[PDB]
Amino acid sequence: GPMATAVQNPLETVVLQAWKDISGADDFTTTDSFLGHGGNXLHFVQLASRLQKIFGVEVSTEDVFRHGTVEQLARFVEQSRDTGRNPAAQTQ
Incomplete structure (x- = not known):
């Protein structure tokens, strides 16, 4: 399911989907x-x-x-994806 399971991360749904294909763990949440x-x-x-x-x-x-x-x-990735480069670049 595209972005079906999303506990505050729209990305996390693609992550486990990889593990399902890699290891074969379909029942992995x-x-x-x-x-x-x-x-x-x-x-x-x-x-x-x-x-x-x-x-x-x-x-x-x-x-x-x-x-x-x-x-x-996904917790860290979505943030790293949103911020992009320059880690925690505040007061830009």
Whole structure:
């Protein structure tokens, strides 16, 4: 479902959709955790750089491992996507 599951992130719905294709976890939700649902270490690597494409943001294994959930991934991504470059550039 296009942007069906969106817990305050319109993006998070594409993130788990990748994991469904990568690992095959169809019953993986956005607020659910990869590692809590059972994830394979190399698939985090694949996922990360897969997400990097659809996010347009620099994503490596570190981030998908740290946030644990695609909800918390989209949480930072949507902000990085909105702000673009120059991290936290205030008083522009």
